RNA sequence: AUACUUACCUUAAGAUAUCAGAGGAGAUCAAGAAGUCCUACUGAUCAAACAUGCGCUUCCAAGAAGGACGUUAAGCAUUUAUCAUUGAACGUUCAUUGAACAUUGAUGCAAACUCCUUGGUCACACACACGCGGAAGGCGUGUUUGCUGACGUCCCUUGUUUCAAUCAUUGGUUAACUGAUUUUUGGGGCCCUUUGUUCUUCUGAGAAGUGACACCAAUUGGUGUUAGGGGAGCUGGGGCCUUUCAAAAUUUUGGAAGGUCUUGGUCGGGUGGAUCUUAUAAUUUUUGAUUUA
């Protein structure tokens, strides 16, 4: 997976931002959160072909300013579903989150 | 009585209008006198037939119910007919 | 067009909106309605009239459509040869701005009547 | 309600275009509040000519427009 | 005795409308006018199998991309040919016409 | 019934065609009419745009230039000069070809404004009713003015020049008159 | 402005919530109509405005949306640039006579550049998940009215923001300290397109004012502007908390009062207008001659 930054958080709420990022990057996972911490940050998750597309980058956003790519620190959930137990991992992560 | 649009057509007297007709003919010329029933009389009329030709009438009188629309000049955009709040100076007695 | 037209508004509430009124011919008029009447004679400010040609109509059949626009500006369309009207753009100035503008228009009108009463004296 | 303003055309040779291709030339003998039109010496012009009798009266529904062929 | 009053009992009801052109319209009535200028929010409108004038009148109304989905359509009365009511609605309730009742008591 | 005239701010007690025609041709109506239309245009030209001008957020700004304001009397004076000059530039047309073709055989059918046949019947019909108290036409031929330089015509007028740059002309023309 | 003269014209009708009772019009015939009509009467639904919410929903910065009635551009491909009569030569060509836009176009396919107008280029932050005030609509609650409106408060500032110093006042703790507010000085940033360097006038930020100003025509006539922000007083609404009273089985509901927060403001009429009925389903817009047979 790859996390992109500076991606113009005031574009949309949920799905129109997933359309505007997929349009300027004309993928199976484009996670974008409305929380204040993850604001101008998003995470797309296709892993080796996604690494090739991340190695292809120079990409600017439809609202304007250029987006910086980066590799994901852990994974997306779709990568963990591709590697598939996992439900117990989701339960443990939720139990750490509510803690 | 009239209502706003035919009052506007009563306003744009003697000024260069363009009429489409239902036939597709778009007469153009100075507007001699419109009536309330939208029968409009025109002068120095230049006409476009549906076939694509152009001719010049002097003095036409096109009936209202075959008008497709009429275009008045631009300035009547700013007209006192459109003023929503102009108060009436004590109607007659 | 995501314009989200007022779900309880008719013509008088639609004033100064940018319309897309459609006729019996299939011609479209686009512009600010500034007035209507009982017979649905509209005025249409800065109006542009678009047809499709007979040839482009073939492409319209079950896409990029070379609509032909002439510019009719301030026109005053008739209620006989129309079909239906919709709304295309919201007006320039918002509801607060329209509201304050109407307040100012009414204050100026009352003032002009005071001046008529003064000149009558 | 208002009777039309054909008073200037009262004796002058006018040319109706009737209906979309009918073109009739006469002299305006009369008009009513509906633009029913009494013409004298109607002479229908096809682009061939055909004369239309002494007097004629033409429905103000069918009449599209009329031109003054005579000078005013 | 006019039946437009019948339609005036039908605000916020979901009908279809077939026009004299051949346009078919689906979407709720917000109101109806005296001479049946019916205003309709949440339309999507369709043209059955074709009429070229109706093809133009369909495409040109925006949001065509042949179902055209439109937020708000006023429709003129002399364009409305026929209007299909919902079958859930009971006609025995609506045709009673309190004006016609009062006129029977006025006689 | 009542026909309110929005310009005159008067009424017509019962609308009919003849009082409408007689009112819309009336000189009082035309005067208040013309005042109003001029008035709307001079308002819209006077009215400043005052856009929002959404100011963006931004090293190389090292150069600084001096603005130039004026006095309030100087402001009002230069604005008055510009008003007069706009009013000139809109109104003025170019004569020349009238003064150029003065002697011509068919000047008096073509440029004498209602002998042209095309606009010709207008200016007779557009003539106002002349109820208050107090043309070179087609008759003119070649043999009216046989020899134009016998009876002295005035010369071709000297061309006009911006007074703002009137100081920068060629001093001392060749060939004195 | 006044007088005189002439010309033209003088009234479409009705209603303004709807339904059911209370009472009236206390119904002119031997106890009673039925109905219909009115109402500061009540109850129910509907409509409109205002206020408040909705942990409503959506949209808000080199690019995105829209447009070019611009070009590259004679870019490339295709098609078309009258009829009739007479004569001659082998349907065609030429000549004569009579009758009635434009090829650099038109149509199709795009593509690119340039240009134009709009927008929270907000506040916060630049980070490893799975914020307030804007704009548009929907829903809910409450008030008010059954159409609408016409006719018969004070003070400060208007380049803004932040930091330090000085002084005044007020509170707390033991003359010292801390916090708040106001004034002055200075510096930094942003901005001055405020394009006339700024609600109007004048002067080169200051001064005055809230009928005046600005301006076009010929003192008269016409149009526009008289603003924006902040605070206080007062008032309206919502939310929370406390007290009291009532009802139901410690809890719930309703009313009142106080405190705190947030948002907003500072009777009549032959009158007209708006909406809806009726003339009005017969040639002029709503009771069909625009699915081309
Ligand atoms: Zn007048």
Tokens describing residue F128: 């106002």
Which CATH number characterizes residue D47's domain?
A: 2.30.30.100
Which among E11, C117, F36 is positioned nearest to B90, based on CA atoms?
C117
**Residue D70, token pair as written in the block:** 């005579």
Give the range of the structural domain holding residue D8, as residue numbers without chain letter: 1-72
Task: Provide the number of structural domains found in chain B.
Answer: 1
F15 touches chain D (CB under 8 A): no
Beta bridge partners of D66: B61, D16
CA distances from C85 to C13, D62, E47, E75 (A): 14, 29, 17, 7
SS3 E67: coil
Structural domain total, chain E: 1
- Beta strands D13-18 and D63-68, pairing class: antiparallel
Give me the sheet containing A2-5, strands edge to edge. A30-32, A41-44, A2-5, A64-71, A59-61
Task: Give the phi and the psi of residue C16 in degrees, each rounded to 5.
Answer: 65, 10
F18–D contact, CB cutoff 8 A: no
Nearest nucleic acid nucleotide to F82, CA to C1' distance: G196
Structure determined by: cryo-EM
CATH (domain of B90): 2.30.30.100
CA B77 to chain centre: 14
Q: Which of C71, F12, C82 is nearest to B10 (CA)?
A: F12
Taking the CA atoms of residue C15, residue C16, residue C17 and residue C21 in that order, the dihedral angle to the nearest 10 degrees is: 80
| Residue D62 CA to ligand 1 centre (angstroms) | 36
Which pair of tokens denotes residue A67?
């987006």
- The torsion of the CA quartet A10, A14, A16, A22, rounded to 10 degrees, works out to 100
Number of H helices and E strands in chain E, helices first, is 4, 5
Secondary structure (H, E, C), F126-162: CCCCCCCCCCCCCCCCCCCCCCCCCCCCCCCCCCCCC
Resolution (A): 4.0
Q: Which domain holds residue E74?
A: 1-107
Q: Is B74 on the interface with C (CB under 8 A)?
A: yes
Cα radius of gyration rounded to whole Å, chain F:
27
Q: Torsions phi, psi of E87, nearest 5?
A: -80, -10
Residue pair E28/E6 in contact (Cβ under 8 Å)? The answer is no
Spatial distance between the Cα atoms of F154 and F176, rounded to a whole number of angstroms: 18
Residue E74 is encoded by which pair of tokens? 């006023």
B80 touches B4 (CB < 8 A)? no
C-alpha closest to that of B45 among B34, B32, B61, B56: B56
Q: Which helix (H) or strand (E) holds F177?
A: none
Total structural domains in chain D? 1
Distance in Å, CA F119 to ligand 1 centroid: 29
Strand partners, B28: B18, B46
Cβ partners under 8 Å of residue B89, min gap 6: C113, C116, F9, F10
- Structure tokens, B53: 């030709």
User: Burial level of A39, CB count in 10 A (0-12/13-18/19+)?
Assistant: middle
Contact D6, D28 (CB under 8 A): yes
- Which positions on strand G lie below 7 Å from a protein C-beta? 7-12, 18-19, 35-37, 47-48, 50, 57-64, 67-69, 100-101, 107-110, 117-131, 134-139, 149-152, 190-197, 201-204, 211, 214-217, 221-226, 228, 270-278, 281, 283-288, 290-292
Give the residue from A8, A5, F12, D52 showing the smallest Cα distance to B92. F12
Query: Who among F9, F15, F41 is closest to B89 (CB)?
Result: F9
């Amino acid at each position: 997976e790859n996390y992109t930054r500076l991606l113009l958080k005031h574009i949309n709420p949920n799905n129109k931002y997933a359309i505007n990022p997929s349009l300027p990057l004309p993928l199976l996972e484009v996670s974008i959160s409305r929380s204040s911490k993850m604001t101008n940050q998003a995470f797309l998750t296709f892993q080796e072909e996604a690494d090739r597309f991340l190695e292809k980058y120079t990409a600017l956003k439809v609202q304007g300013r250029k987006v910086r790519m980066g590799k994901a620190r852990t994974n997306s959930l779709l990568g963990x579903x591709x590697x598939x137990x996992x439900x117990x991992x989701x339960x443990x992560x939720x139990x750490x989150x509510x803690x | 009585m009239n209502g706003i649009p035919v009052k506007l057509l009563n306003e744009a007297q003697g000024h260069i209008v363009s009429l489409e007709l239902t036939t597709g003919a778009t007469y153009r010329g100075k507007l001699v006198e419109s009536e309330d029933s939208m029968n409009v009389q025109l002068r120095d009329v230049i006409a476009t037939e549906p076939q694509g030709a152009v001719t010049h009438m002097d003095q036409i009188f096109v009936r209202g119910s075959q008008i497709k629309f009429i275009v008045v000049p631009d300035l009547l955009k700013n007209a006192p007919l459109f003023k929503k709040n102009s108060s009436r100076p004590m109607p007659p007695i | 067009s995501k314009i989200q037209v007022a779900h309880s508004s008719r013509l008088a509430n639609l004033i100064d909106y940018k319309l897309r009124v459609l006729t019996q011919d299939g011609r479209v008029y686009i512009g600010q309605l500034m007035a209507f009447d009982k017979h649905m004679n509209l005025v249409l400010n800065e109006c542009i009239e678009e047809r499709v040609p007979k040839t482009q109509l073939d492409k319209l059949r079950p896409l990029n459509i070379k609509v032909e626009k002439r510019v009719l500006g301030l026109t005053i369309l008739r209620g006989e040869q129309i079909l239906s009207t919709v709304v295309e753009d919201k007006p320039l100035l918002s509801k607060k701005e329209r509201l304050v503008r109407d307040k100012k228009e009414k204050k100026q009108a009352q003032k002009q009547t005071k001046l008529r009463k003064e000149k009558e004296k | 309600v208002s009777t039309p303003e054909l008073k200037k055309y009262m004796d002058k040779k006018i040319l109706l275009n009737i209906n979309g291709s009918r073109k009739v030339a006469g002299i305006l003998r009369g008009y009513d509040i509906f633009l029913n039109v009494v013409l004298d010496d109607a002479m229908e012009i096809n682009g061939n000519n055909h004369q239309l009798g002494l007097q004629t009266v033409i429905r103000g529904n069918s009449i599209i427009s009329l031109e003054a062929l005579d000078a005013i | 005795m006019k039946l437009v009053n019948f339609l005036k009992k039908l605000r916020n009801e979901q009908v279809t409308i077939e026009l004299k052109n051949g346009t078919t319209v689906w979407g709720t009535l917000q109101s109806v006018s005296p001479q049946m200028n019916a205003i309709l929010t949440d339309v999507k409108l369709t043209l059955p199998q074709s009429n070229g004038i109706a093809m133009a009148s369909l495409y040109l109304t925006g949001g065509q991309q042949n179902i055209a989905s439109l937020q708000y359509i006023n429709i003129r009365g002399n364009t409305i040919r026929q209007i299909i009511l919902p079958d859930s609605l009971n006609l025995d309730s609506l045709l009673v016409d309190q004006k016609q009742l009062n006129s029977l008591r006025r006689s | 019934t009542r026909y309110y005239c929005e310009y005159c701010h008067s009424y017509l007690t019962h609308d009919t065609l003849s009082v409408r025609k007689s009112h819309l041709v009336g000189k009082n109506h035309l005067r208040i009419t013309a005042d109003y239309y001029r008035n709307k245009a001079r308002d819209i030209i006077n009215k400043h745009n005052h856009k929002r001008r959404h100011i963006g957020k931004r090293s190389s700004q090292n150069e600084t230039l001096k603005v130039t304001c004026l006095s309030n009397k100087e402001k009002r004076h230069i604005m008055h000069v510009k008003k007069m000059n706009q009013k000139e530039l809109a109104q003025t047309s170019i004569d020349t070809l009238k003064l150029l073709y003065d002697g011509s055989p068919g000047y008096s059918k073509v440029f004498v404004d209602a002998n042209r046949f095309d606009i010709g019947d207008l200016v007779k019909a557009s003539k106002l009713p002349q109820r208050a108290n107090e043309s070179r036409s087609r008759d003119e031929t070649c043999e009216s003015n046989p020899f134009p330089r016998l009876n002295n015509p005035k010369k071709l007028e000297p061309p006009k020049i911006l007074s703002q740059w009137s100081n920068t002309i060629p001093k001392t023309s060749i060939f004195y008159s």
